[PDB]
Design a protein around this ligand. Structure first.
Ligand code: FAD
Ligand code: FAD
Ligand code: FAD
Ligand code: FAD
Ligand code: F
Ligand code: F
Lengths: 359, 359, 360, 359
């Protein structure tokens, strides 16, 4: 009878709410957020800026991340087997190439059709290791719309509201009008927004890792490619070039990984950079008719098929995501934030842990 | 060189920004807001919920409100003579009727074509006083779109951003990324949202006055009607029924005046109440074919032409709007908020005062 | 059951089809047409070019036209009383002014709220007679869409097909594939296209009267105005200026009456003419903010609210419409064409006569 | 100064008009047609019903058809090299399978990347010959829109008009109003409509070959497949199953070849037939997630991605297309009609001959 709040309507909050409602049928759940999946794109809302591909960054020794990523893959892949592309999922061969390293992450061996490839067969030079396996991409707008429909069907009440502090959920008459009584519990799925909701030491742990992408219309591309330069360093370190094709024919090209960079608007030079690198790792990203042209001329061909530029801020945190049980303003609090560049590939895993902590 | 911030992209912020940029051509102006005019309607954003009509509530002794309301009428009426309905304005005869009173507000005598009518000619019973005069309605979405285009043309930079505190404008890296240097000044045009930005005693002076409206498609209606019940009490007291026709053929029917009511969703019984009262004061709101039908059948005819239901929170303030110079967080601050049910009819007057205070 | 063909999907064909299906006479109805109401506007398809208003041209001594026009008025007015504007109908006050004449048609006295006005109160000069009465306008696209839905609901089969001759309905495999069996009957509701379907010496009787109109967005205008110059001459003679407001806020301004003029495209000078004459007869057609300006500036204000120019060819015929039973190409034939500038205002009346002729 | 008429705005008329205006810049050209490319689909207008692919039917000894087909290929391929998919063209690998034949048409060897394949590798049974080569598909609505824009830019006047007889062009006031003076010449590109415009011996040569197609949304398919059953017989004989993918992700599945069948509406049993046969010759037409399912479940999966059913009448003629100079009703007449199922793959070839015959 006392309301349970899910604060956040990104992929993290919506998956949390789905698992919450499935575990406790008819529970009194209110989802509050100041940005919703179908809103216009905004650099501050990470979930619809994402590619998204399932391409784990889980260190061999990071048992929690490996578990989350593979659990999430299992859920998404079973869903694709059931409904195909209806919710924005597309199974595909993912190819990862390393420019330095002579190993892949052990976590990839859990995916179907894992193969070690000859690094000399990469289209770009200096590739020292190369693997492929079956994975999935997600058109986030489509998938999030499906999650929104699902939480409605499960009986969640949805509210557009800004929450200035966790205490406000108990005290602010504007918020109390939504759910009548002070909440018994809150799931804090506020992404990078959690910086304004937690005490100073925890707030300090959050930082943006800015990512710019270029979305092209390239429906000929139905395979995934990533080039990793530099060590992950047990986290999400180094830089990536990637080709992330969606089932709708939009293909996300990236990326950048700028720690502490709060600039929300795309940079012209980075557009050029992304297009140039995308052509290096995946020559077939070019419009078919332009593929025989000098490499320099193919950038303009890619420009001609650009759908949009986009920028987002990965909600980065030292040690990865905070999924933990605490207390604030007399409410039971479950934190589920700080997923960096891996929220889409870990969402269902985190959601299940979060609900288990609450329960 | 130092940025000047306009916080808010409602009618108050946008008129403030226009007058600011007109007074000081090429100034470094950045407009920050978490809700913009063309966004989907939300009860928290009053400017696009409003009717809006110019129907002053200024008490005979309220010299400041009278001056603002008359100034705003002059600006809007001048604009209508220059551009017609291009920006959402429509000149019309406004008829006001009182159920109890035997006097009107002196301020109305400043409008063109002021006439005292025979109250016995009102279509509803118990009317003791009635006047008409030339006034204007505004389709707020259209007018705000023109204001947005105008501030762009004048060189303002526009940002979608939430401001958690005034200090954050100078200290918060997420906001500093927008304009680089710490701002010298901020115009706080945050509407009811100002309650999160000011000290608790100022925040306590602000309260919502909830208003529900029904929008109908009634392009045959090109005249305005209001019935006042109870005393204004030197502010915006009592209750009103109104018919507010827009140039686009949508006609806003209302209303309610629920002080402290934070419920953002429409109430079914209130829909019935509004349609019933609308028919009382203006029989011609009914579709022409339905005008000879019994009263109950005519409510049904109005239901058949409903476009939308909407709810908004008027940013009411004890003593009316705060338009004042101050200092806070190392900035020169001009507050311009708390216009209640009168922001549209006072906007330009208030904007000119705000810019003068800053200058 | 042998097919019964309605040839034409203008207002005449569709009303004929509705009345045919409503007759419940076991008719296996196939509606064939090379232009359908929701198709792009084309000067050759009169029904969606029309204003349309109900403003009878029926001469005092033209009993058939008077009966048709008043019957159609009753049907449309009752429809408006039942459903309001849902099917594109709008009741309004129609004001007619004459430049020269000292009387009105008797037929108008049958409308609600009839009155003879003081012609000195007309906004333009040289007005010698003026009346008003309650009438209706029709947004033809909306009303025709409603008729199309209605014939579908009643079980008619609808086909996009060009009929090269009446005989072809029985003999042409391209047409026979639509309905399998040779048709027993055809209602020829082909409008000006009937010139290619009726025996050739009857075709000389049909001619275009070209009409250009300017459609403006003027939702403040919900009253109708017409000025008649010259005599009707027992038919549709002389020239008219008119303001015909639709329920959707589009207002049709006109008009021209160019006999034998087959030019399907709007003329620049005619746009200027129509706007100028519209302002003469109805000063409030101008945008409210423009009403105090010089006449030339008001013409410019009208140009600023133009939605579209359009041209149509009225299916004119000496003697008015042919509504008649015949036998041709082995089939029972009912002709229902040649309604000139009055198809909308006579449609239901004609449809009922046509169906009665077939039913025998 | 005397008008030149192009009668018809299908692919044949519009290519003729383009070549006409390019040869004689500023010429007084009027294009008359009762159906235009952007009109709603109609079984009587073949050009937008077509797949279309470039898959020649030209007999080894049919010099004219081979010349036409290869010239048209050259023109379209050059266009695709210049603009890619901008005008609806997509280069692809076309694979043809024969159920009986042990040879391919010689004309195919003129296409790039020609190769004879192992017929054992066909996914369906009883294949005895198989080849592939580079060819093109066309999204006809997009291509015809480009042609329409081209003729406008070259100064053609376009008219929606029905021509009851060629004599009417000189004598009918309804047609004379379009171009003022009796025309000097007419290019008769009326497709199957030519049967109403030519003398009884020439009209008897024309007949419909009805084809029904199913359009699916299958953007994973960018390769073309055809199975030929029975002999071409020096013409377009026998029956074909085909997969014709467009650049916009629509894929046309077919077909039927019913001579003299004037039924313009799709048959339910033919939908089933086409879907079943498409799956036989190209298992990858099925949604990726459905590819391991039993055959009946895959047919159902194809039904779920259906965009539209369509029917058209190929303008078939004894001896193929009539491209011929004549004199009728006072005019210099060039006939260019009766292209059967090969109008798209022969259009530019025929157009050029037609303009030459007139010049
Ligand atoms: C360019 C780019 C590419 C990426 N690609 C991938 C990829 O391929 N695979 C992958 O797994 N991940 C990827 N990511 C990362 C992924 O997008 C994020 O980890 C994930 O979206 C974070 O989800 P979230 O729900 O925590 O945050 P968000 O999506 O930002 O949502 C937070 C929610 O909380 C609400 N909120 C916050 N504060 C408040 C408040 N005070 N009051 C009310 N509401 C509040 C917001 O309105 C919003 O609804 C990418 C990120 C970027 C930027
Ligand atoms: C039903 C109804 C009918 C009405 N009818 C009339 C009428 O007929 N005539 C009339 O004169 N008035 C009318 N009003 C009143 C009028 O709508 C308000 O007085 C006026 O819109 C207030 O404008 P504003 O710009 O102050 O507030 P708002 O429109 O609410 O805009 C405030 C802006 O501040 C931004 N903001 C606030 N806090 C923050 C933050 N922390 N960070 C970033 N951005 C922030 C918001 O995003 C928004 O852009 C009506 C009101 C209602 C509810
Ligand atoms: C500018 C203008 C204003 C007007 N204003 C008014 C007004 O205010 N009030 C009023 O009452 N009337 C008005 N009219 C007149 C009215 O529009 C016509 O009288 C009426 O539309 C004629 O209807 P119809 O069905 O006979 O002809 P059409 O609407 O032309 O329809 C004829 C049908 O026959 C079909 N057809 C013809 N030949 C063939 C063939 N060979 N094969 C297959 N199909 C064929 C066509 O495709 C079409 O479906 C106006 C006309 C014009 C031009
Ligand atoms: C199902 C199907 C699949 C096909 N697939 C292919 C393929 O893959 N490759 C290929 O090469 N071909 C294909 N075709 C064949 C191709 O569609 C035709 O050969 C080609 O479209 C014929 O073009 P057209 O311009 O002659 O005829 P149409 O496109 O029918 O155009 C005739 C034009 O003449 C006009 N017209 C006719 N009579 C008159 C008149 N009396 N007055 C005014 N205007 C008139 C019409 O309005 C129209 O504008 C296919 C056909 C079908 C039915
Ligand atoms: F906040
Ligand atoms: F014809």
């Amino acid at each position: 009878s006392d309301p349970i709040i899910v604060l956040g309507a990104g992929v993290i909050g919506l998956t949390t709410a789905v698992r919450l409602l499935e575990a406790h049928l008819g529970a009194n759940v209110h989802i509050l957020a100041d940005h919703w999946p179908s809103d216009a794109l905004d650099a501050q809302y990470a979930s619809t800026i994402a590619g998204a591909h399932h391409l784990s960054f889980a260190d061999d020794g990071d048992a929690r991340q490996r578990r989350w990523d593979m659990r999430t893959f299992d859920v998404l892949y079973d869903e694709w087997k059931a409904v195909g592309e209806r919710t924005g999922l597309m199974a595909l061969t993912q190819t990862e190439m390393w420019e330095g390293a002579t190993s892949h992450l052990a976590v990839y061996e859990g995916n179907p059709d894992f193969r070690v490839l000859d690094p000399r067969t990469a289209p770009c030079s200096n590739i020292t290791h190369m693997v492929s396996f079956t994975s999935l991409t997600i058109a986030p707008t489509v998938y999030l719309a499906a999650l929104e429909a699902r939480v409605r069907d499960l009986g969640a009440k949805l509210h557009r509201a800004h929450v200035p502090s966790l205490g406000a959920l108990r005290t602010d008459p504007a918020l109390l009008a939504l759910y009548t009584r002070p909440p018994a519990a809150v799931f804090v799925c506020a992404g990078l927004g959690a910086r304004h909701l937690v005490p100073a030491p925890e707030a300090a742990a959050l930082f943006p890792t800015r990512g710019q992408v270029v979305v092209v219309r390239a429906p000929w591309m139905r395979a995934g490619f990533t080039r990793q330069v530099g060590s992950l360093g047990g986290g999400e370190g180094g830089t990536r070039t990637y080709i992330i094709p969606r089932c709708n024919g939009e293909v996300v090209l990236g990326g950048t990984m700028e720690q502490g960079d709060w600039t929300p608007y795309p940079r012209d030079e980075t557009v050029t950079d992304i297009l140039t690198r995308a052509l290096q790792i995946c020559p077939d990203i070019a419009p078919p008719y332009a593929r025989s042209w000098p490499k320099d001329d193919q950038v303009a061909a890619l420009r001609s098929i650009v759908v949009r530029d986009a920028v987002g801020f990965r909600p980065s945190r030292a040690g990865g995501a905070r999924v933990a049980l605490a207390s604030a303003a007399g409410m039971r609090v479950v934190y589920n934030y700080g997923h960096g560049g891996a929220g889409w590939q870990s969402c269902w895993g985190c959601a299940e842990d979060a609900v288990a902590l609450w329960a």
